Each structure stands twice: as C-alpha cells, then as structure tokens.
C-alpha cells in the first residue's frame, strides 16, 4: 500500500500461473505487482548506499600566500633565480622587465625577474573512488489486503508486521527471500552491477555538501590539487601574478572559488552522507520476482455479513484508481470484504477491477478500520461495498568548465 | 632623458605645433630642428569626489527558516514572513495524499521563507569627468648625467625637469624650462577614456574600472547608494537556492562566496588603486598639442669645449638602436658646447648618423663634471668620437555568463 500517493507509480501484471515478474525499481518510483490468485504487493527502492570510499584527489578552492620574495637580473645576464623555486611549498613566475642605466644595469633591454610566494590552502574539496562491490540497495515491500490509511507511510516495526518487509541487495548478495507471514514469501533476483556505472563516477565533498560527478570532469578542474591523503600541483590556478608596466611584479591570491564550483556542479547528481556511508537518491535496479511461494492469506475466510461505513471520502489517485477506507461494525472477523464496482444496481454485474486483491477484515473486534484500492471503468459507476440492505454505495466517475547533465 | 630605457618609446619629429599621444607606461621623445630634445610622459591619472551608486552582495547567510503547507484545493500557503522584506520566499506545488496528511490526491501549496543577511559586499562609484586630474612629466636633453633619468625630487628648482597638471577645467599649461624657454601644452582631457560610461568598483580592498552597462547586469543581490544604514536587498534569490525536499518542507541553502567568480568575470576590466579618497589610474591615453614657439636652445651661444673628456660608463645600445654616452669633463672653461659625432673615417671626420640629444653641453664651470648624451648611429661599423684635437676620445660602435568585455 506504500505506492498509494506516488506519481511515478508502475502497475505490472505478471502471467497467471507464471513464476517470474520483471520489475524496474527507481528512486522516487514505486511498483504495484498484481497476479491472478496472488496478493497485490507494493515494491520500492528506498535507499542506495555506498561504503568504504577512498580518497583520490583533493582540490583547493580557498588559498593564502605569505613570505613573498623577488630576484632580478640585468639584460643578457641570464634567467633570475630564487632558492624558493626549489621549495615545493612555493609558487613562482618568471617575467621580463625594462632595465637600463637608471635601473642598475650597464645594458638597455628586458631583464629577467622572478617572484615567489609560499602557498597554503585554507579550504579544500575531496573526490572519492566508488568500488562497485561496496554498494547496497534497500528495497521496501508492502502487501494489499488489510492495513488502514496510516500504514501507507510507516517504516517502524516491519520485522513484526507480516504485511511490510525490508530487503537488502548487494552485488555479492543479489538474491533475497522476504518472509511475508501468512502471504508466504517473495523472491528477489536483482542486477545491482547494471544500475548506474560507478567505475566512471566519483564522490565529491565540499563544505558538508556532496555530489556524484563524472571522473573525466573531476580530473579537468582548474584548481590546485594534491593526491590522496600536502604537495599542491597547479598552484597557479589560485595565484595571480600582476606585472606593473614592465617595472615590478606583485603576487596576490584569487579569492574563494566555492561559488564558482557550486555553479559548475549544477547538473551533477546530488548526494548526502550517513556518517561514513554515502546515501544516494538516484538510479534504478532491475529485479526478477519469484511468485512461487507467494500465497493468498484469507482465501478460506467467509464473507463479511455486517455493515460498513466510509471513514474517508473515496479519493482518485494520480493514475485514476480509487482509494476506499472503511470501518466494520461486525465481530464475525476475520472475514472477506465484499467490494465491487457496478453500472446497474439491479443485476450488480461487476465492472472495472480491484487493485487490492482479496480485501479482508483481520480483527475479531468491532469498529476496525481497513483500506482497499479499486480500478474503476471510464465514465459513471458505483463503488458498492458490503452485502444486502446495509451495503454502502458511493457514486464514482473516471476521466567554461560546467558539469554535463548526467 | 626620462624616456631612456622605456620599451614603449615614441620618437616624434615636428613649425609651431607638435601632436603627441601620452600613454601610461609609454614615453614620447620630441625632436625639432634648432630646438632642444624634450622627453614627455603621462605619469598619473587621478579621479576625485566619487559617489556611491549601487552595492552588490557576494557572500550571504540565511537564518530563521520556516515553512507552511496546504492540502490540494485548500488554497495558497502563507507565512507571516512573506510580508517581511528581510526574508526571501518561494511558493511551490508538492504531491499530497493520504500518506502526506490530506484527504485529496493532488498538488498542494508549499511556502518556505529564510531571513537574508549580507556578510561581504562590493561597491560601485560614479565618475564625474570634471573631477579628473592628469600629471605630465617633462625632461630636457642637453646636460644631465645618468642619475637624472630616474629623479622626481626637485623639478621646481631644476630647469631641465618640469611637472605639468592637466584637468578638463584647466586643459592648457605653460611649463617654465629656465634657459630652454617654455613648453606650451594644449591637451584633450575629456577624450582620453570616456568616464561617463565607466564605474569604479571596490571589492576586498581591490579596485577596477568597469563599464556601467555590465555593472547593472550583475546577477547578485543589490542595494541602492542612498539606502544607508539597514539595507534593503533586491534580487536576494541570486545568492539563495530553494531545493525541493518533501510534502511539508522545502530546503533553503545559501550559494557561498562569489568573490572568485566576480574576480574571473573582472578579467578584462582595467585595474585601479586607491590613494585615500582619490582613485589612482595606471591606464589610458591623453592627446596633447605642444607649442614650440617659446622653446629655445640653451647653449647655442656657448663656445666649443677645449679640454679632454673621459667615458664614465661604456656606451650602451637602447632597445631602439640609439647609443647612450656618459662623459666626465676635466676642463674649467664651462659652460661650453660638447663636441660629439659619429665617424666612419677618422682622417676627414665627416659626420655620419645623427644626435638624439640636441646641442650637448657642459653647464658647470668646475672640473670633473659628469654629463650624458644620446646618439643615433648609422647601420654597421662607426666610431663614437667625442671631443676635439689630440685629447679626443673614440669608441668603436656597430648597429644591428556575465564576463566583462
């Protein structure tokens, strides 16, 4: 019943008597699987989690410079040299300035000038490698039949509840058997390696903000970088050397690139961190479902004899199905809920179909709530639930260096 | 002699008027028949009384963020913070249903508000064409040793050097050059750079000269110059991002420092510096018409130097092929005319090439006095022969996206 309310909802109908049903589980998407003489199960990929990520390269986006010195040479006296050029913590640039009799040279021409400054990084971003094996897919199951409106959004106590179940799929464990109590069990044979190619993807971390970027883009970033776990390569990206009318050379740092990186990241898939593990809200997972051990809990129940009352007004979902929530005054439970659509109330010939297969009242106590989903025909019809004189009827009617987009 | 050593050096040969274009980092050597060689350079452009126009925020922070949501067909969502101009808000439509807290399935109204505050800002200033001052430096050839090429201290007392100040309200000047007479300067200050279409931008103690149309197109939150004290920011949405989260709340997050992005956008703009309240400029040209009428040759009446000369420095070739010669005079017959020339054959001493320094002279009546002259030699082998008679000195020479527009 967890798919009820989801706009990206897919209704799959497996072959009658057939064992397998192929499903595509997307994030923010939901699959309602239906089969003849089988209960309706709602299957959804809830979370994709990446573990044991390793540092590859770190880019500096905010830097600072200190201990800046210069060395100059007269024309034809060769290139200028500072002992700081042999220091890997320093950023240097050679230029040509006008030299002469007033400048301290016996020759007129362009003299070599070198300026060095000690580079230090204030704020940095980190790129992490993703191993395909250290990837976990969490699937949530929910069975139709019983359960009221309050169970559509409930993830506390699925271990004790037979109607709801949690499934964990990894490339090392791509198969699972989900115990559904009286409903039997659902088999899940999934393809985790063919969901989102993580060999060409990196995990980027900024000021507590995370993304999933293409590896080729990350290696093309125009910022100072250091390998894994520092010696900064391409320090020139955050350092500017200003030449002053061929007389002097000044060195100044280029401010925070945080904003420029944020705007470049527009197009990349956003992510979040769950301590050490990385949470993902994008990507699909192809699964083959085993219907073999899936059974109808309540097929032996007798029809509900007492009166029903609508707790909520029957509502149309985004896909045209009707959700009905009813209260049962009877104590003859567990019993089969009489539910159908009718165009003519004299014959009561059933029109349309039921999404909720075998709707049942489980409690033996009175005033118990229950929810069912119907697929009505196009045009006018009547949602007729219950039997005899006390039956309730409701009239219904249907109808640059920007990141590329992943 | 101030142009000696400058790579961007122009040699103009003028007649009463001589038209010159004075650029920053450039130098003009003006030469004329029966007139002294004058070196003219535009040293500083200064802008005064600049007024604030608009201030753009490049680093912001958000606080006190709240949300309000409504079920489908229950109308638009409202927060009391939407009526507060210190808050940035966005209305959206989210999926609502039986699991979300609604009895109806459809798009429900959701509103999110956050208190906007600016941490760091930049300021744009208007430039009035009248509040603009140009400073020109003059230096005459004839006397002066090597040490005078770079000297700006006592130009008031020195006849060879002079300071000229040109403004749109005073575009003309008469520069007293002592014995050399005077140089007239009729300049065009208003057609130097067109400051009516330019603004003065100030960041983290960094200054630029930007086009006014570009500055008004900046995608950043802005407040008017007149909005003193507590400021009202227009277009706060430029630094604030609204991400869709769920049916009851929508996440709001600030975009981070745009300082680096503004710096990279400013690549192309003319850089400037501040001198307290006045703005210093190191770019732009100034067109001047020079009056040669009152300019005279100090030393035309002097007799030729009879004593011996000594080279203080080795004659050096400038970037343009001219030779600079610095000599010491042992004689006391000064003031006298320095005998200077180039020769291919020492028997006849027929002068080859030409002199850049017109009428080289020794001014002091005392011995061991230093002096510097500039020569333009012919191509190939020649001799820098200075002095007269037996004591003359000879030296062998040889020639040859919101990017700023």
């Amino acid at each position, epitope marked *: 019943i967890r798919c009820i309310g989801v706009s990206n909802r897919d209704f799959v109908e497996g072959m009658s008597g057939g064992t397998w049903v192929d499903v595509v589980l997307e994030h923010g998407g939901c699959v309602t699987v239906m089969a003849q003489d089988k209960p309706t199960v709602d299957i959804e990929l809830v979370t994709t989690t990446v573990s044991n990520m390793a540092e590859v390269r770190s880019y500096c986006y905010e830097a600072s410079i200190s201990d800046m010195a210069s060395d100059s040479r007269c024309p034809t006296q060769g290139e200028a040299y500072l002992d700081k050029q042999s220091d890997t913590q320093y950023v240097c640039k050679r230029t040509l300035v006008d030299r002469g009799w007033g*400048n*301290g040279c016996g020759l007129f021409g362009k003299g070599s000038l070198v300026t060095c400054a000690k580079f230090a990084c204030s704020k940095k971003m980190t790129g992490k490698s993703i191993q395909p094996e250290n990837l976990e897919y969490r699937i949530m199951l929910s069975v139709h039949g019983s359960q009221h409106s309050g169970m559509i959004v409930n993830d506390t106590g699925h271990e004790t509840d037979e109607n709801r179940a949690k499934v964990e799929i990894t490339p090392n464990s791509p198969r699972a058997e989900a115990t559904l109590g009286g409903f039997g069990s659902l088999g899940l044979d999934c393809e985790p390696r063919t969901g989102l190619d993580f060999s060409d993807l990196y995990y980027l971390t900024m000021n507590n903000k995370h993304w999933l970027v293409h590896k080729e883009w990350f290696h093309d970033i125009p910022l100072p970088w250091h390998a894994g776990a520092p010696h900064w390569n391409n320090k020139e990206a955050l350092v500017e050397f200003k030449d002053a009318h061929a007389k002097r050379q000044t060195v100044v740092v280029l401010g925070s690139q945080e904003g420029a990186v944020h705007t470049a990241l527009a197009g990349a898939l956003e992510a979040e961190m769950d301590g050490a593990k990385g949470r993902l809200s994008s990507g699909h997972l192809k699964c083959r479902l085993k219907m073999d051990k899936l059974r109808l809990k309540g097929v032996s129940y007798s029809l509900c004899t007492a009166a029903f009352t609508f707790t909520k007004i029957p509502a149309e979902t985004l896909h045209g199905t009707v959700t009905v929530e009813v209260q049962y005054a009877g104590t003859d439970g567990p019993c089969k809920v009489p539910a159908q659509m009718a165009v003519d109330m004299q014959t009561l010939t059933p029109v349309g179909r039921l999404i909720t297969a075998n709707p049942v009242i489980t409690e033996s106590t009175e005033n118990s709530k229950m929810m069912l989903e119907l697929d009505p025909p196009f045009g006018d019809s009547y949602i007729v639930i219950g039997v005899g004189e006390k039956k309730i009827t409701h009239h219904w009617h249907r109808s640059g260096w920007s990141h590329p987009q992943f | 002699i101030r142009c000696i050593g400058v790579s961007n050096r122009d040699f103009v040969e003028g007649g009463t008027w001589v038209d010159v274009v004075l650029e920053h980092g450039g130098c003009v050597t003006v030469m004329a028949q029966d007139k002294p060689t004058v070196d003219i350079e535009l040293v500083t452009t200064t802008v005064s009384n600049m007024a604030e126009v608009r201030s753009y925020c490049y680093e912001a922070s958000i606080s006190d963020m709240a949300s309000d949501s409504r079920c489908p067909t229950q109308g638009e969502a409202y927060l009391d913070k939407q009526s507060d101009t210190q808050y940035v808000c966005k209305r959206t439509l989210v999926d609502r249903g039986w699991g979300n807290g609604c009895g109806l399935f459809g798009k429900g109204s959701l509103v999110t508000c956050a208190k906007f505050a600016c941490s760091k800002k930049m300021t744009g200033k208007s430039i009035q064409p009248e509040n603009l001052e140009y400073r020109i430096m003059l230096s005459v050839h004839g006397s002066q040793h090597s040490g005078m090429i770079v*000297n700006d201290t006592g130009h008031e007392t020195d006849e060879n050097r002079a300071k000229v100040e040109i403004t749109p309200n005073s575009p003309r000047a008469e520069a007293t050059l002592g014995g050399f007479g005077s140089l007239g300067l009729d300049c065009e200050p208003r057609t130097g750079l067109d400051f009516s279409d330019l603004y003065y931008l100030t960041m983290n103690n960094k200054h630029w000269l930007v086009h006014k149309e570009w500055f008004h197109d900046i995608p950043l939150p802005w407040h008017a110059g007149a909005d003193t004290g507590t400021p009202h920011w227009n277009n706060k949405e430029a630094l604030v991002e609204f991400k869709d989260a769920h049916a009851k709340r929508q996440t709001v997050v600030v975009l981070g420092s745009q300082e680096g992005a503004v710096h990279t956008a400013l690549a192309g703009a003319l850089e400037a510096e501040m001198d307290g309240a006045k703005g210093r400029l190191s770019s732009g040209h100034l067109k001047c018409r020079l009056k040669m009428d009152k300019l005279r040759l100090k030393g035309v009446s002097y007799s030729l130097c009879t004593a011996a000369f000594t080279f203080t420095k080795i004659p050096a070739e400038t970037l343009h092929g001219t030779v600079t010669v610095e000599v010491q005079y042992a004689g006391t017959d000064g003031p006298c005319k320095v005998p200077a020339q180039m020769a291919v054959d020492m028997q006849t001493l027929t002068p080859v090439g030409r002199l850049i320094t017109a009428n080289p002279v020794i001014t002091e009546s005392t011995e061991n006095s230093k002096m510097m002259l500039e020569l333009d030699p012919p191509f190939g082998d020649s001799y820098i022969v200075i002095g007269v008679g037996e004591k003359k000195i000879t030296h062998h020479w040889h020639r040859s996206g919101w990017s700023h527009p």
Partner: antibody
Amino acid sequence: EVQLVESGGGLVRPGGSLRLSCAASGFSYSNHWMHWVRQAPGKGLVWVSRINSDGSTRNYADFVKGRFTISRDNAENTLYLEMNSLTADDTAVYYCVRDGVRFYYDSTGYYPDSFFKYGMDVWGQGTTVTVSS
Amino acid sequence: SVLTQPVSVSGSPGQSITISCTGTSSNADTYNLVSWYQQRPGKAPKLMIYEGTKRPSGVSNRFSASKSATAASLTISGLQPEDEADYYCCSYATSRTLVFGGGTKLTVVG
C-alpha cells in the same frame, strides 16, 4: 650633512625583545638600500640585514633565524630592526648603514639583482644592545 | 662564502703593507665585489675600497687594492701612524647576503 643616528639600544633580558631605530638625513633616503651591521665587544664586524627602497626585499644573515625583522618608513627617514628571542650571542653595538654605491647604479633602490655592486659608505655611531640577565 | 684575513700585520712608517682576503666556497665574483673598511680605535668603520679595486673620493691615494680569481688584497703605501686600525674585507656570502672577514689589526711600529 649626511648622517645616520641610531636609537633603542640598552639592557634587555635573555629571551627579550627590542626595537632599534635609525634616523637618516642629508640624502635621498627613500632611494637607498639600508643595512644593519653589528659588533660584539672586542670582536669583528658582522653583517645582519639589508632592505631595499620599498621593503619588498629584506635579507638576513644565517644567525637571524627569523628572530629579527628589518623595516623602514621612507617619509620619516627611519630604519628599524625589530628583535625577538635575544640571547647573549646578540650582545653588540648595532650600526645603521647606507649602501651609497648601489644608488649610482640603481637610483630607484628597488631591484634585488644577484651579487650587485655595493659599498657601505655612511655609518652611524652605533647603539649598544646588551642581552644581560 | 667565508672570508679569511691575517689576524695581524706590522709595519714601520714610510713602508708598504698588503692585507689579503681569501675565501672558501667563493668564486671570481666574490673578489670582484670585495669592499674594504678601516676602523680606527674608537671610531666607526670607513669605506676604503669597493668593487675589488675602486677607491671612493676623499680616500687617500696611499690606499690601493688588487684582486684575482682566488683572493683580494688591500695595499697601504707610505705608512703613517694614523693608519693604525682594524681592516675588514667584505663580500657576498650568497646572492642576497653579505659577510665580513675576521679583521686584520695593523700596528704602526717605532
């Protein structure tokens, strides 16, 4: 005429700090390199530091392992030597010195050319600094 | 570069004396850039020679200097009692730093 007058010398405790000052007059101060030289009692002259016209180049002897900072105020015709973490090894007469020769070659006093022609032609009388507990 | 000088030199009035300045980790440029300083008892040092052999104006013509690729030397001709002083040579230790020799005490005897 041309003179250099040092100040700020006196008794300082071991590990202490001191700021020496030098007043220059009779020459174009802003265009000259300035040096500090010291002489321990009964010992030889020891070069300490030099500074160019704008202060973009400040050089130090090996024994001044970042403990001293040379500086200048051109409009005030003043030279300074900020000294920290002083030891008995630093007890000496400190002389303020002008490089008059470099001015003849580079009248700007800016360019820090390697091994340039120099001459310490003007010396102050020196100020005594004693690093005594 | 480290500069070494004799500890002391003796001379009689009217005679000539030569003070050597030799370097370790030095080169021809070290000696090309040698400057010499005279320090009379209780007086501040005075520049006598710069650029290895150049004598500043005002300095007596009795002072001359020579240099080779291995040493620099100061020569005082026609020795006078006023020449009694400590003499120091100076040159570059590195491209950016200077160093003085240990000094030579010149005694004028008799």
